[PDB]
Design an enzyme around this catalytic site. Structure first.
Site, mmCIF file in Angstrom:
data_model
loop_
_atom_site.group_PDB
_atom_site.id
_atom_site.type_symbol
_atom_site.label_atom_id
_atom_site.label_comp_id
_atom_site.label_asym_id
_atom_site.label_seq_id
_atom_site.Cartn_x
_atom_site.Cartn_y
_atom_site.Cartn_z
ATOM 1 C CG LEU B 77 -1.927 -1.053 1.376
ATOM 2 C CD1 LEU B 77 -2.624 -1.039 2.621
ATOM 3 C CD2 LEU B 77 -3.007 -1.162 0.361
ATOM 4 C CB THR B 80 4.692 8.256 -2.535
ATOM 5 O OG1 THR B 80 5.297 7.198 -1.947
ATOM 6 C CG2 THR B 80 3.701 8.834 -1.687
ATOM 7 C CE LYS B 119 -5.666 4.874 15.592
ATOM 8 N NZ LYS B 119 -6.675 4.946 16.682
ATOM 9 C CD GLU B 264 13.405 -22.614 51.241
ATOM 10 O OE1 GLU B 264 12.864 -22.627 49.930
ATOM 11 O OE2 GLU B 264 12.759 -23.109 52.432
ATOM 12 C CD1 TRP B 286 12.899 -21.778 55.860
ATOM 13 C CD2 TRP B 286 12.243 -23.697 57.186
ATOM 14 N NE1 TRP B 286 12.929 -22.917 55.025
ATOM 15 C CE2 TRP B 286 12.505 -24.058 55.977
ATOM 16 C CE3 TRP B 286 11.565 -24.599 58.031
ATOM 17 C CZ2 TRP B 286 12.271 -25.528 55.495
ATOM 18 C CZ3 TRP B 286 11.520 -25.891 57.772
ATOM 19 C CH2 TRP B 286 11.856 -26.133 56.464
ATOM 20 C CE1 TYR B 312 13.079 -30.277 52.140
ATOM 21 C CE2 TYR B 312 12.646 -28.660 53.762
ATOM 22 C CZ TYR B 312 12.193 -29.714 52.654
ATOM 23 O OH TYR B 312 10.721 -29.760 52.579
ATOM 24 C CB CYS B 372 7.406 -30.626 51.905
ATOM 25 S SG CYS B 372 6.595 -30.195 53.609
ATOM 26 C CG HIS B 373 11.445 -29.852 49.076
ATOM 27 N ND1 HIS B 373 12.820 -29.555 48.845
ATOM 28 C CD2 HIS B 373 10.973 -28.894 49.631
ATOM 29 C CE1 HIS B 373 13.350 -28.300 49.541
ATOM 30 N NE2 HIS B 373 12.182 -27.826 50.231
ATOM 31 N NE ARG B 392 6.562 -34.939 54.518
ATOM 32 C CZ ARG B 392 5.795 -34.023 55.270
ATOM 33 N NH1 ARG B 392 4.570 -34.209 55.247
ATOM 34 N NH2 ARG B 392 6.344 -33.045 55.781
ATOM 35 C CG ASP B 395 0.570 -24.231 50.648
ATOM 36 O OD1 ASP B 395 -0.326 -23.865 49.959
ATOM 37 O OD2 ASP B 395 0.966 -23.744 51.755
HETATM 38 CL CL LIG Z 1 2.776 -31.980 57.168
#
Ligand SMILES: [Cl-]
Ligand SMILES: [Cl-]
Lengths: 477, 489
Positions: B77, B80, B119, B264, B286, B312, B372-373, B392, B395
């Site tokens: 387009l 010119t 546009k 951590e 913690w 841990y 937990c891990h 295990r 959360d």
């Molecule tokens: Cl627990």
């Protein structure tokens, strides 16, 4: 037979092809199967139209459907249409009786006539994994059909069963939006089966995934393996016992092995005495001395599984030593805690005793499992660090399914799920052809597990107390 | 504009909405983006292709856009320039389309830009579909893509990809089941209470794994009590996986505190069990679990405040050592799992026993919280490091997003020190739960549309895992939705 094509069969068939006995259903009623047959035979694509259901004079019983009887010995029945010929019945209904679809509900002669003249396009068949006495049989399905759909395996107190469908013979944005090349796995398990709800397909798909996409790399054994990392499979243990059916798996050794873990034994002679040889090679003089265990008796396997389950943290001496009251009895504690506090989130038995690794013949493969309780059903999750898909994994699935069922009985709980986490999943190069055959086989309904219900302590189970019923399988590979 | 609807845009856009700078692409080139654009603009449905073998798509630009784009009718387009080497030229858009559809056999018309062209197309409602490459970085520039009208929503999201200098993904904006599949479940023939981002139908952003699990647990999880007093909706057994070569999976649907995750991890690596080491850095992960009241209530009555027992770190470095207290020197004692596995990866990457296990059954009772891990396993193939971790107790609201990030950093750290490339982080969830007091938070979260994930850049000079410090671990191009407050129960 012009205008009489595209007829659909519904039938329930025993393992020996029996469908009737003295004009009755040869097995105890399967409520589920009749729920299934009803739902399939009353379905209308989305006002007062009904489907048609056809049976022979013999079939001795249907609501919300048009009933058509095929007889030359009666022309009047309460509520039903009657015909002398199948040719006549189909042509008439399709011209003059407005309906949706026609189903064929039986008599062997009806099924044989429908099948022999190529008039059936689809068969919904309930497969029962038991032979039942009978006098009426479903005809062989011609090689012109294949199974295109398989349900989960279900069970009652007396049989396991499922539903199949036999039949005769992807938008661009879904490809583009992966971000990867727009332009097919070398291996696919049972490609013909399009609805794949049998749990065993989890396993077949993984075999196919490893052969297709696994990396060929070496390992401790000498023989190389195609390998891929990270899978999860689930099995509903309230429904069936997930013993693979695409090849014959024997369990006697697995069950003796489990019982031996439960007794806490590290003595490999206990298994050999029962002619269980799983652990023989790893207890020999050669393997022991090679792995540094110069000073140990043959078939003293060290503080492996059973020792860890019953005596975690106890000082290991030999397989003859007395470990009573020594270490932590994980298995006993966790059973107790399930009974006493089922919502505990620490119901774990760990065999990966890091301090004892250097003393073990083989470090544990099924390293770690965890129980879970929800709505009075016991679930179990197990971590398997190294997973032989050819030979090992199928035994592991059964073993931990049996253990979970054992723990559920003694704790007075129902059954939930076995969830199996695979880490290094591999096929050894030697087994590629066995596996290729396996994934091509259509699976049978899984079996059921029946435990002696009098056993109330985990230590009291014996091999006669653990029975797998209704096991139908393809041949050993 | 009669007959000038369903134009399809393709565009690449910086975080500040810049698409151009001095008639040049503002960013260093993303070849992936060109291949994407190519594949999208040259695709003919096989239906149409067989009935018209030589048919092509149309591609329109203003004069400004300075590269003919092969296999397509190039339309240009301008007011010119009346002819261009092997292109169609037009005064304005209106006539272009009318002519192209009336007189030039084609499949589909695509608009490849100029701001004014974008546009015009948007303002007049001519576009039904936008294929947009999202870049997570602001770039200097002077040409912007117009705001997308509230009349469009995102219906497709690709995985997050990255280069050396930006993370990005591809999205589609758009304006606004067979009976045998149901019968053959064997169960009821006839909707989950919660669905994450229900307008997004193609769902390849990895964060959807986590969003789908939140919806699943809310829809079908069982409300159960637990040791915290706050109940939780609970469900058992999931698996997520994250491609750590393409992106860093720091969740985008809420702002995650990266700094606290890193501190951590470094704290675990040093083998520390002193919660004050974290507090001294205003990291409060913690603090509740090292408090006087909590220690006493769990029997740790003679233990010092914020002495967390042999959790841990202690297990990673000194497994089997006798725990005395958090001040005791443990050097040389126990089994240094982190060191040994790192060593095993270098020496024998095809070892099938690359496990660090924090679940020390003999030490469970001395711990503030058992871990937990519990357990992670490494894996090498094709010179890429992967990791699988077993959690295990998960959360979903608060803990899991931290875990995903933490282990992804760890795998990257271990990869760098072993001279490996990056594979996958694989997250196994056992007891996955949403606490009752996170329910509103998570319902808010799962309606939010994910941004492309960020990238992770490790200081390449670091060669021992113990030498990593926070400045060495950088996350780049993190775009996120606002933070969602959630109480630690
Ligand atoms: Cl627990
Ligand atoms: Cl091994």
């Amino acid at each position: 037979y012009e205008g009489c094509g595209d007829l659909t069969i519904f039938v329930a068939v025993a393992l020996n092809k029996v469908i009737g006995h003295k004009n009755q259903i040869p097995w105890p009623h399967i409520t589920h199967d009749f729920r299934f047959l009803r739902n399939g035979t009353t379905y209308i694509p989305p006002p007062d139209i009904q489907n048609v259901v056809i049976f022979g004079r013999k079939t001795y019983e249907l609501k919300n459907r048009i009933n058509v009887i095929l007889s030359r010995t009666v022309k009047e029945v309460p509520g039903c249409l009657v015909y002398e010929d199948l040719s006549t019945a189909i042509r008439d209904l399709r011209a003059n009786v407005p309906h949706n679809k026609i189903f064929i509900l039986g008599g062997s002669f009806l099924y044989k006539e429908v099948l022999d003249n190529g008039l059936c396009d689809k068969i919904y068949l309930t497969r029962l994994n038991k032979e039942y006495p009978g006098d009426t049989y479903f005809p062989d399905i011609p090689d012109t059909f294949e199974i295109t759909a398989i349900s989960p395996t279900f069970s009652t107190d007396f049989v396991s069963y499922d539903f199949v469908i036999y039949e005769r013979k992807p938008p661009f944005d879904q490809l583009l939006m992966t971000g990867t090349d727009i332009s097919k796995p070398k291996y696919v398990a049972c490609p013909g089966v399009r609805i794949r709800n049998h749990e065993e397909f989890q396993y077949l798909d993984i075999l196919a995934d490893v052969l297709s996409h696994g990396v060929l790399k070496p390992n401790r054994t000498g023989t190389d393996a195609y390998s891929k990392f990270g899978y999860q499979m689930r099995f509903d243990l309230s429904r069936s016992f997930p013993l693979l059916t695409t090849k014959k798996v024997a369990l006697r050794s697995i069950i003796e092995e489990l019982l031996w873990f439960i007794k806490g034994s590290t003595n490999g002679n206990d298994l050999l005495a029962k002619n269980v040889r799983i652990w023989e090679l790893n207890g020999r003089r050669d393997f022991l001395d090679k792995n540094g265990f110069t000073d140990r008796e043959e078939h003293d396997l060290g503080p492996i599984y059973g020792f860890q389950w019953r005596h975690f943290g106890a000082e290991y001496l030999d397989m003859h030593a007395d470990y009573t009251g020594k270490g932590i009895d994980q298995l006993a504690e966790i059973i107790n805690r399930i009974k006493t506090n089922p919502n505990d989130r620490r119901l774990i038995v760990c065999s990966w005793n890091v301090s004892d690794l250097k003393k073990m013949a083989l470090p544990p493969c099924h390293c770690f499992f965890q129980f879970y309780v929800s709505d009075n059903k016991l679930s179990c999750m197990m971590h398997q660090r190294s997973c032989d898909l050819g030979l090992g994994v199928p035994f592991n699935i059964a073993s931990y399914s049996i253990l979970t069922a054992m723990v559920a009985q003694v704790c007075g709980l129902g059954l939930g799920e076995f969830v199996h986490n695979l880490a290094d999943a591999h096929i050894y190069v030697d087994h590629v052809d066995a596996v290729t055959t396996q994934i091509a086989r259509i699976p049978h309904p899984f079996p059921r597990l029946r435990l002696n219900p009098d056993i109330r302590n985990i230590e009291d189970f014996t091999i006669d107390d653990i029975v797998v019923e209704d096991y139908v399988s393809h041949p050993p590979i």
